[PDB]
């Protein structure tokens, strides 16, 4: 029916016009007066060795000390970052994991990958071993990202162009967040854990309401597939990273691309993005073997975290914002501070 | 220096390190293969000769070599998002059905897929064990239907040997990296010797890699 197509066209036009109407000025113009942060020299405090394959994901614990790491050797290594002690080494049923999550409480760890199953491992067992607490099956594509709402419910994103809110106890999809045209690659929980943003391969980041279970806003602007996404600390903005070698800060309330972070010397894709505690620094992991720390308000390349011998796959910032942990394909986890 | 608990935790970490080491040494000897076919290209036949969702693991030992074959059928999404997962695969067992040239076109799609995989930036130093399955059916199909229906400007006889040789040559094209060596082999239904040619190809790839590391290639 052409009436629906033309009506959707006029709708898109109305959305674009509404977005443009409220865009009176740019963040770059407003932030020209503020003093620019001086260059930051973060040193490699620790190097976590032990993985024997490409590290694909990591997730800091809420105590900012423990961190879990997932690689292609079928191992979930939970490290003690302070002492570089391997706290746990969980052997994976499928050695094809692309994500790993640490529960806020610090009791469970979730991972998954090309097996299309979100394996949840209980750490606080009376037997003193880590056993598979739950096997969340149902996604028809590879599991790209997973984040715990709490110990009972977990949101995951899959390569079948779908996010799913699961209830761990029952092991069924409580909610199904559909709408992305391309494979959903990243997730980012809002601080209040009410809404979440998901960046897919259709060059669009979609905001979903966890309770209602349906999309709220859609943000476009990237010229390629989005790989990473991360909320701003306050929970009103979020930054994305794509294969077009650009970071994009969008604002939820303004509902439009707020600012871009691109350099003419950078051409490789982006794999991970994270904010500092205050949100002033935007740390992005690139495929040029090093991480770049940008000024979130000036788009000035504050620093370059170099040292990894392969593509930077994942990075995370602690809850207290003390150090940043970068996991790369060279099978190394470097902690920078 | 360290307290009793810190020392016991360090000992635990050392035991974990030792286990990770042993597991790595045990797993490093495995020959990892990627069965990358195209639908009804003869993946089920070749895997049945060698031996709900997600990739399929086929592990088999043959003459002191443990081959771990990975079949990626359930992944209907875009390839590139998980091709990097199999970056260090020893070889790609690419299966193509010779019969599927006139009927659908199927053959053009197989050539396009082969082009995409062979020229992928992750598969640069990766050899392809090309299998031309269902040769029996092509035996009579070429005698009934000419090969020109699929490949314009063939300009050759529609016989048995030369038609397959041409198809093989057209598949050996679209190969740029000199390091890549396509071990084209024509199979038919079930022969119970495709494991032997797989072993011979794998050992040739291993030798090539060793000589490349030493600096002789």
């Amino acid at each position, epitope marked *: 029916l052409d009436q629906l197509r033309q009506e959707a066209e006029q709708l898109k036009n109305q959305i674009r016009d509404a977005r443009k109407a409220c865009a009176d000025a740019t963040l770059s113009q407003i932030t020209n007066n503020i003093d620019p942060v001086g260059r930051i020299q973060m040193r490699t405090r620790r190097t976590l060795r032990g993985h024997l394959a490409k590290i694909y994901a990591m997730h800091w614990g809420t105590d900012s*000390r*423990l961190l879990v790491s997932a690689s292609q050797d079928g191992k979930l290594i939970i490290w*003690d970052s302070y*002492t570089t*002690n391997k*706290v*746990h080494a969980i052997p994976l049923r499928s050695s094809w994991v692309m994500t790993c999550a640490y529960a806020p409480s*610090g009791n469970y760890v979730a991972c998954g990958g090309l097996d299309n199953i979100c394996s949840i491992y209980n750490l*606080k067992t*009376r*037997e*003193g*071993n880590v056993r598979v607490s739950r096997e969340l099956a149902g996604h028809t594509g590879y599991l790209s990202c997973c984040r715990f709402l709490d110990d009972n419910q977990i949101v995951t994103s899959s390569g079948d162009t779908t996010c799913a809110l699961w209830d761990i106890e029952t092991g069924q999809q409580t909610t199904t967040f559909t709408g992305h045209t391309g494979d959903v690659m990243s997730l980012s929980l809002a601080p209040d854990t009410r809404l979440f943003v998901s960046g897919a391969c259709d060059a669009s980041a979609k905001l979903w309401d966890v309770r209602e279970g349906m999309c709220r806003q859609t943000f476009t602007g990237h010229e390629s597939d989005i790989n990473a996404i991360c909320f701003f600390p306050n929970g009103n903005a979020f930054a994305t990273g794509s294969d077009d070698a650009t970071c994009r800060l969008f604002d939820l309330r303004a509902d439009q691309e707020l600012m871009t972070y691109s350099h003419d010397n950078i051409i490789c894709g982006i794999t991970s993005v994270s904010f500092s505690k205050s949100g002033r620094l935007l740390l992005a992991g690139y495929d040029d073997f090093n991480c770049n720390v940008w000024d979130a308000l000036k788009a000035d390349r504050a620093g370059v975290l170099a040292g990894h011998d392969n593509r930077v796959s994942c990075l995370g910032v602690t809850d207290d914002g003390m150090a940043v942990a970068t996991g790369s394909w060279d099978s190394f986890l470097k902690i920078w501070n | 220096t360290l*307290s*009793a*608990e*810190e*020392r*016991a*935790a360090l*000992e*635990r970490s050392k*035991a974990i390190e030792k286990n990770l080491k042993e597991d790595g040494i045990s797993a490093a000897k495995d020959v990892k293969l990627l069965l990358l076919g195209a639908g009804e290209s003869g993946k089920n036949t070749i895997v049945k000769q060698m031996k709900t969702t997600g990739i399929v693991e086929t592990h088999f030992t043959f003459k002191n070599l443990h081959f771990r074959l990975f079949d990626v059928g359930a992944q209907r999404s875009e390839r590139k998002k998980w091709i990097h997962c199999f970056e260090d695969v020893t070889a790609i067992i690419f299966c193509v059905a010779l019969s599927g040239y006139d009927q659908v076109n199927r053959m053009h799609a197989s050539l396009k897929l082969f082009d995409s995989i062979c020229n992928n930036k992750f598969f640069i130093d990766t050899s392809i064990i090309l299998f031309l399955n269902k040769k029996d059916l092509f035996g009579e199909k070429i005698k009934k239907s000419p090969l020109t229906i699929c490949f314009p400007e063939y300009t050759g006889p529609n016989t048995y040997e030369d038609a397959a040789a041409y198809i093989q040559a057209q598949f050996e094209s679209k190969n740029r990296s000199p390091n890549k060596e396509i071990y084209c082999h024509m199979t038919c239904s079930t022969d119970t010797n495709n494991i032997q040619v797989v072993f011979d190809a794998v050992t040739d790839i291993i030798i090539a890699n060793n000589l490349r590391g030493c600096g002789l290639y």
Partner: single-chain antibody
């Protein structure tokens, strides 16, 4: 999870005895095992420890040479071969599991114990002994250490244990703060380096028993005298 130990009996002073504790219901291979004895009508006294993998073995100064501890992972068993005995070696020998990693709760589970009879360090003190309480009000048990337990890393290695009358000691608190799994929130441990306090907000019928304060800063592990709370 259970530890069933056997071997306890009447032994001549010069005789040898082989205590065998069979563990079942948990990953025995990955737990550090302690032989801790309680003399008749006396407090706890740590005897020996063997780490996960039999890598590290410690003995008390009073049993060095005479006693030997050995582990059998295949069959999940702990052995205590005591060669030479004395009149002071009669005790109730408990097998205590203790896994050691960051955030772990060592000494969480205790075995039933075997009553065997026969024919410098951190001086842990309490100076409390008997405390006569009626159920309902708060109770404050004070433990004092000869040496400051606050390690530079930033935690104190104090362990509150509850031994109910005629039962195996149970872990109440570890690192003087963290309550053990299954312990109600009434128990609250506090302290500073030397002086430590265990507070029970509301005492019930089941709280009657002996309260031991153990140090875990460095071997040998020394228990307190034991504060007995009763009606």
């Amino acid at each position: 999870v259970q530890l069933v130990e056997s071997g306890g009996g009447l032994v001549q002073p010069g005789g040898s005895r082989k205590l065998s504790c069979s563990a079942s219901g948990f990953a025995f291979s990955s737990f550090g095992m302690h032989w801790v004895r309680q003399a008749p009508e006396k407090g706890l006294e740590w005897v020996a420890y063997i780490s996960s993998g039999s890598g590290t073995i410690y003995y008390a100064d009073t049993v060095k040479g005479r006693f030997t501890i050995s582990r059998d992972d295949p069959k999940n068993t702990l052995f205590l071969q005591m060669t030479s005995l004395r009149s002071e070696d009669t005790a109730m020998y408990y097998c205590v599991r203790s896994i050691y990693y960051y955030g772990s709760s060592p000494f969480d589970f205790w075995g039933q114990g075997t009553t065997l009879t026969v024919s410098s360090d951190i001086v842990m003190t309490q100076a409390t002994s008997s405390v006569p309480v009626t159920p309902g009000e708060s109770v404050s048990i004070s433990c004092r250490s000869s040496k400051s337990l606050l390690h530079s890393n930033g935690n104190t290695y104090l362990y509150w244990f509850l031994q109910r009358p005629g039962q195996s000691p149970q872990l109440l608190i570890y690192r003087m703060s963290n309550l053990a799994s299954g312990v109600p929130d009434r128990f609250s441990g506090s302290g500073s380096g030397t002086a430590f306090t265990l507070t029970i907000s509301r005492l019930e019928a089941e709280d009657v028993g002996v309260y031991y304060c153990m140090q875990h800063l460095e071997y040998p592990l020394t228990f307190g005298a034991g504060t007995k709370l009763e009606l």
